[PDB]
Design a protein around this nucleic acid. Sequence first.
RNA 1: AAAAAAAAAAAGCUGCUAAAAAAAAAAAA
RNA 2: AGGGGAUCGAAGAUGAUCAGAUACCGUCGUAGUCUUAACCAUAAACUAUGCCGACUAGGGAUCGGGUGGUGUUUUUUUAAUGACCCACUCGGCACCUUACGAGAAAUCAAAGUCUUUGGGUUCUGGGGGGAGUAUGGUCGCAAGGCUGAAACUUAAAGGAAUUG
Lengths: 50, 96, 25, 129, 97, 216, 81, 206, 125, 87
Amino acid sequence: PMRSVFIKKEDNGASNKPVLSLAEAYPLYESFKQLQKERKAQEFQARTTA
Amino acid sequence: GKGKPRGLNSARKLRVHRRNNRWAENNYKKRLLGTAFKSSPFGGSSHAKGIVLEKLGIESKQPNSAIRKCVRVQLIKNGKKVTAFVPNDGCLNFVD
Amino acid sequence: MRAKWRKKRTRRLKRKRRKVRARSK
Amino acid sequence: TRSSVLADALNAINNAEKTGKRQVLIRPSSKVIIKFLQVMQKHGYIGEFEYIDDHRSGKIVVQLNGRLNKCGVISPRFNVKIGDIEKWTANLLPARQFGYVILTTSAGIMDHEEARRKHVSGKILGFVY
Amino acid sequence: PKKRASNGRNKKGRGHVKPVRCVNCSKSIPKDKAIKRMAIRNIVEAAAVRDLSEASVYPEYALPKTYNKLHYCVSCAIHARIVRVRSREDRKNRAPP
Amino acid sequence: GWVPVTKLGRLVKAGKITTIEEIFLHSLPVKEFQIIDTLLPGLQDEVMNIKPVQKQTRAGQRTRFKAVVVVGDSNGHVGLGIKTAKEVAGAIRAGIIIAKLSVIPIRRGYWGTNLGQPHSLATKTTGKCGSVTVRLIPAPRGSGIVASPAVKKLLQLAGVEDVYTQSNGKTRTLENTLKAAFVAIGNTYGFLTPNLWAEQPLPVSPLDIYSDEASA
Amino acid sequence: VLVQDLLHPTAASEARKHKLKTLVQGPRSYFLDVKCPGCLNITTVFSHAQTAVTCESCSTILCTPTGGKAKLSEGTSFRRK
Amino acid sequence: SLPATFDLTPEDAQLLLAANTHLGARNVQVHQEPYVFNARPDGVHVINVGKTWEKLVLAARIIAAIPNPEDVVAISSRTFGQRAVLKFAAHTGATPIAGRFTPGSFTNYITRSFKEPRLVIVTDPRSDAQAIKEASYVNIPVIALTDLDSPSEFVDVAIPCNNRGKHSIGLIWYLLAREVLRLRGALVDRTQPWSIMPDLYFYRDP
Amino acid sequence: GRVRTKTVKRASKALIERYYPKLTLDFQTNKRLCDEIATIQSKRLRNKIAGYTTHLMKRIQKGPVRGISFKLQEEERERKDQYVPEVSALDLSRSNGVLNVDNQTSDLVKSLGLKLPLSVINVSA
Amino acid sequence: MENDKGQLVELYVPRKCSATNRIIKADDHASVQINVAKVDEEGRAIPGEYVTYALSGYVRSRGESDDSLNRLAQNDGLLKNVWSYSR
RNA sequence: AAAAAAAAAAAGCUGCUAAAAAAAAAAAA
RNA sequence: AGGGGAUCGAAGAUGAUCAGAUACCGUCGUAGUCUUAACCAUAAACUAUGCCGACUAGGGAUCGGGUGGUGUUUUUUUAAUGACCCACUCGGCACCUUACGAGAAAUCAAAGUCUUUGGGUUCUGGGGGGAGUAUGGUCGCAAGGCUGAAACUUAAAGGAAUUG
Ligand SMILES: [Mg+2]
Ligand SMILES: [Mg+2]
Ligand SMILES: [Mg+2]
Ligand SMILES: [Mg+2]
Ligand SMILES: [Mg+2]
Ligand SMILES: [Mg+2]
Ligand SMILES: [Mg+2]
Ligand SMILES: [Mg+2]
Ligand SMILES: [Mg+2]
Ligand SMILES: [Mg+2]
Ligand SMILES: [Mg+2]
Ligand SMILES: [Mg+2]
Ligand SMILES: [Mg+2]
Ligand SMILES: [Mg+2]
Ligand SMILES: [Mg+2]
Ligand SMILES: [Mg+2]
Ligand SMILES: [Mg+2]
Ligand SMILES: [Mg+2]
């Protein structure tokens, strides 16, 4: 039960803070899901058509 | 069905199989071979007369410990030697 | 004893008895 | 192979009655089966049965009320005389007041009481109670 | 009495199965009876991954893995705790843990 | 006092049920022996044997006593109870209670031609327990009970006047052979006969007729 | 189920059952009335034909045998007779 | 028979189809269920809601035939049916057992929760297998809210339904309470609906 | 170890069950009321009971506790499960008066011979 | 059954199963007796007027009690379209 | 899509017999 | 008896271990292991479950074939095929759940339909040893196989489970 995670910065300086905060990204993620929701409806529409 | 034949014309098989199986009984085999006449010491008789050869002391089987006071005795009618226990308290003094 | 080795001992005894009887005959 | 169609039919009826079903299908439906079923139906142990005609050997659907305890075949079909009838009824009937040993006599297939009344005997077929 | 309906093996409708050898002791055991396990292992043992990554000449090196199928006899599997003795009712549980 | 806590016990104490024929007819589960000896005051009891049974412990063997008890009025009803206890007297008392709870009815009949009262059984019957199978066969008048002493006493306390028995298995297991004879005697009201072929109108239970004099 | 009508089973259940297991057994095969392009020459073909049935006028193979039903050729016209 | 005012009204059909009681189990199907009508694609089967309605009114007739209303016992170990059996208990006599059924409640007369019911109603026979097993020891009729794969052993009246849904269990318990009250006469208007909303018999997350 | 036995635990639960509004979240006052409101033969046992009671009052203040039910708790439970929505979920007002149904549900209701507003949407494998 | 001169003997004529017509024994504790209320012209159930079915422990344990009750109820007319003879 | 694991010096023997449970009645201030 | 004879390896040689250790463990190593021709006829040759036939509970999966579906995918978007999916069916190797039923129990869809005892048929057993021995046949080069007792001895051997 002692397993733990160790994080190390990359030496080159490649590691960097992400451009968007997690919070900022989430609505957009929801929007993709919303597009997917439209697409799931589209899948139903495609099924309905053929 | 069962391992026996059941047909209305299978009486010969039933009878023969019964004879073959009768041989596995102890009493039937003794009576049909005549082992009492052949190999029994008394020859199939209930009683037999004999002559005392000697006196013996037989140790008891477990879990008992005693000397049983038998006699080694040779039968008159066939000459076979057997061992006969002498019963009750002190009857070995009677048997000589 | 183990039955396999009892069978082996019996087979050896049977062979020895055959040899002795062949000496007799 | 199939050696007694009467044995198969009576076994199927027994297993149906034990399971509690009210109907049973029987293949392949001989004349002896029909007569045996007619004796059972006359004494009220089965009910109505129907013969289905294929052109092979026939099938039978038998209706079952709950009254049957056991119907069986006696195999082989033993030769039976007049006193041997009461010996057989003593061996395989539950009581002296009900139950029937069914036997094929020269005057047709009948139960043992009808055989006693006609004073005929024969070969034993089976039983019902 | 009979302990298992499968007789401790997996052979229904064959008769004979070619044997394999225990990886620990080289006992001959039929292939259906053995205690096959699949050792799929990283090549670098999870504590030298950083050292090999910084010593690599290549970026994004895939770091392969080793594949081995281990066959155990009953004695060696029980002694090495690969399987252990279960209770009478739990013996029938076929599912992996 | 009794103060029952069961609908059946309340009805039997109130007197709305006066015979055990209603209980047998409606298959009412009995859980109080005061019901049984209220409705059958004339049944008598007898112990067949006491045997010791032992359980091995870390410090010696723990010995308890197993009592097999038959109870029964000599016309129609019998019961068989088996109890182990630390004391022989307590085993006998609890076995009497259990035997009273197990009372069953007996179908007595005629070997033939039905002149007097039913003297024998109506059909052949068999019970099996363990290896023991006990078969009971109707017998003609004056035969008596052809049985071993224990099953003969059980049949006497049930009220059979004359019967044949056949036993197979290890009959010296007394508890097994007594349970097999109880199963055999119990199956007489299991066998369906042409006189019972006729249809009956399915009566209403006392537990619904007298539901006001029940628990509520 | 303890009560069912064995003498009148439903047509769906009889169609589901095997051909030897229906109330009265019978075939599930049929015959086809088959025309080939060119000559009219209407012919009768078994549904399970086991042989390359040819039109009597010309080498105009009408069916190809299969493990089950015969496989009719591409240019053919059939009616279930 | 019945005076034909007991037929499936269109509003009751709307309630059943909105609560999805017709959506039975998947292609797993117990042979003791002829209640299937026209198996749908995706493997789901459709229950004959007319048959569910007749079985429900037959069950309500049995409950109305029970003399003391507290001799009816409603069982639900399922959270989706706990509130349903509690409201059934509220609206009828019906001593309930919601939650854990302690073993030996129908046997074992010295238990503090020892009941002697004349009829038992359960929500799921598989989840309430202990109660039906105990009823089979002491001669108790059983009504069960079965599905198409429910274990029908020792079940006398099986009301077919969708017992996996939150709304269907509550609707069936609601309808059962409504019809047993109608046959008792507490609801004198057979034609007019009940003032109690069907959402009263529903499970809620908090 | 500091595991408290069932005499302490059962006495604490009974005390809370019949004296919840009287007693507090403070050990000293809980002790001073427990000694006069219960008959406990030992000062030590009284202290242990009052301490476990105070612990359970803290537990009760942080949400409800299983096994403990007092009058205020049960009256709040009944007042909450007598809740009913303003509009039924099973009402057809939601979804515009038409119940979405499949082909099989549609000819089911035609076989039942009932007329009701429905919309058919195809369900594919 | 009775003796030679009227006079019914055999205490306790037993019940028979409504589905399989087998004798319901005294110790058959898996057997039930269903009572269904009768309804008269207004939708109300009359107290004390039932139609009665007896089901044996065997059929209840085999799980045919529901189908058997369906058939018996439809035969007595208090079910309409539940049970089909042609299975 | 996970991480983990390899280990197996030596240890023979213990004389004979001996251990075992059934039924309940007393009436006293 | 020819061939082959890499590995492993009865015997054997050796090093340990050990009170001993011609045992286990280590290293070698003959016969053997493979093959051709001819013998041998045994195995816990086991499902310790003879074969043929009928019937009796639910459940899913799988192998071979067949039928159907405007089903999916691929080809020439689109045909036929093929591979999948769904439904059914015949025939298999099996499995899961129950116990109406069976059983001494363990357990068993047969080991059920058996005192409510009869579908057809073959083989085998009759307490434990002596003993698969002796003897006589017969087969085999041999090893041995098949057939196969008795005298005498003995109150238990044995099965399945329970608690320690
Ligand atoms: Mg013959
Ligand atoms: Mg002795
Ligand atoms: Mg063992
Ligand atoms: Mg083999
Ligand atoms: Mg004997
Ligand atoms: Mg020594
Ligand atoms: Mg030792
Ligand atoms: Mg020694
Ligand atoms: Mg060596
Ligand atoms: Mg052999
Ligand atoms: Mg063998
Ligand atoms: Mg068979
Ligand atoms: Mg297939
Ligand atoms: Mg298959
Ligand atoms: Mg196969
Ligand atoms: Mg013998
Ligand atoms: Mg012997
Ligand atoms: Mg043992």
